[PDB]
Amino acid sequence: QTVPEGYQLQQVLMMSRANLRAPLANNGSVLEQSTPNKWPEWDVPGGQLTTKGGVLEVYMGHYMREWLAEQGMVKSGECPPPYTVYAYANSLQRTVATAQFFITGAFPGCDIPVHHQEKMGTMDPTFNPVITDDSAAFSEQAVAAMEKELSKLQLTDSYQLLEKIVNYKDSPACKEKQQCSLVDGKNTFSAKYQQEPGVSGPLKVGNSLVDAFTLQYYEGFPMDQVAWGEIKSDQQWKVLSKLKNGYQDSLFTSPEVARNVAKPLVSYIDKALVTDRTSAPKITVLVGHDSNIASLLTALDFKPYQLHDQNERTPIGGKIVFQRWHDSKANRDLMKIEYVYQSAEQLRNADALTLQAPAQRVTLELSGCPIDADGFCPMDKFDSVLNEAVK
Ligand SMILES: O=P(O)(O)O[C@@H]1O[C@H](CO)[C@@H](O)[C@H](O)[C@H]1O
């Protein structure tokens, strides 16, 4: 796609998801349980981003810069006035790190800080995808809603395949804990107040391992290191990644769970973009997590989508960039949202990102903001979406 003539970009807001990180330490014991195999090592601890993650984000920031300059939002090689860019990430190493690389990459040698709560290592409610309603009746409505969501999915082939690549029957889950079937395993969904919706069972092991295999791919481990050369071969990946996208769908894609869990980001966006656009900076960078993008996208009732050359519905370094454009001809404003990310090969190979060889881009759409032939939506309808979403 290519923006039409007569349109001038006015404001940008990116919802980013941190780049290449090591598998979550939080899932450390479920990976040991799920197989008799040895797990490759990482030089970074728990779930911190890797040096490659930073390198990949630098490219992402350089591409974003070239695009922003090309669109008149900034100039190339000169750096913008004091408060042009505003970067905010939550207090996790992972998210703050990717913001530093992104910014240093987009505006090298400038003086654009990265904001975050003073308390680091802990979560910032803004980005914390937790249940903020202790209605009790709500935690029950949530669990059920999740369960129903899982029912729409079909991961039987994913599990069977997973069982084999993982040699799960020889794992200390089948031997010792009698859990010997991912496909028949019972799933129990949680939703305790002030915490992330969870899953205990085959769906967790599924998402945990596949996430580890997926990260291993990107980090560039040789093929015999990514799932021990097992997950290799064709698109067993397409079916294995369903456990990973199905996990996300059940915990954050539910309508009533999304609306709650996302409450703070919707509120944020609906303020920097609507109620307080006059005070907001031309450019904003929110670095969050896939949970945030999953619940955010749902809460604002987005139309389904599909990312080309990507197996994850929320790409490791992908960013949802909201764009307010002003149509010179007809004195009106317009919203154009797009998912800007790096394909899997772009991540695995670490390709220099430039306008010559751009990052992947898919234009999204809001149910309440029908998109036109060029992918634009009137700022009127969008406004109503966010102002309605916050209610
Ligand atoms: O987007 P990342 O941080 O890489 O991964 C996500 O992070 C979420 C917390 O923000 C957590 O709840 C999800 O399980 C995890 O997949």
DSSP secondary structure letters along 72-84: TSS-SSS---TTS
Sorted by where each starts, the structural domains of the chain and their CATH numbers stand as 1-21+49-132+253-391 (3.40.50.1240), 22-48+133-252 (3.40.50.1240)
Both structure tokens of 338: 């797009």
State the Cα–Cα distance between residues 192 and 200, nearest whole angstrom.
Answer: 13
Give the SS3 label for residue 198: strand
Residue 119 has φ and ψ, to the nearest 5°, of -85, 110
State the Cα–Cα distance between residues 338 and 17, nearest whole angstrom.
Answer: 14
| Residues pairing with 338 in the sheet | 321, 363
Atom of ligand 1 nearest to the CA of 123: 10
State the Cα–Cα distance between residues 194 and 133, nearest whole angstrom.
Answer: 8
Instruction: Give the CA angle between residues 129, 383, 307 to the nearest 5°.
Output: 55
State the Cα–Cα distance between residues 62 and 53, nearest whole angstrom.
Answer: 14
Resolution of the determined structure in angstroms stands at 2.4
Solved using: X-ray
Regarding beta strands 283-287 and 85-89, do their DSSP bridges make them parallel or antiparallel, or are they unpaired?
parallel
Q: Which protein residues are within 6 Å of ligand 1, measured from CB? A: 17-18, 21, 129, 196, 289-291
**Contact call for residues 64 and 106 (beta carbons, < 8 A):** yes
**Contact call for residues 129 and 196 (beta carbons, < 8 A):** yes
Both structure tokens of 343: 């394909």
| Residues pairing with 88 in the sheet | 115, 286
State the Cα–Cα distance between residues 214 and 310, nearest whole angstrom.
Answer: 11
State the Cα–Cα distance between residues 251 and 258, nearest whole angstrom.
Answer: 8
2 Cα–ligand 1 center, Å: 32
Atom of ligand 1 nearest to the CA of 21: 4
* Cβ density class 288-298: b for 16+ within 10 Å, e for less: bbbbbbbbbbb
Atom of ligand 1 nearest to the CA of 94: 3
Both structure tokens of 384: 């109503």
Residue nearest to ligand 1 atom 14, measured at CA? 291
Both structure tokens of 165: 């690549």
Q: Which of 61, 127, 47 is nearest to 296 (CA)?
A: 127
3-state secondary structure 130-161: CCCCCCCHHHHHHHHHHHHHHHHCCCHHHHHH
Q: Which of 380, 359, 317, 356 is nearest to 17 (CA)?
A: 317
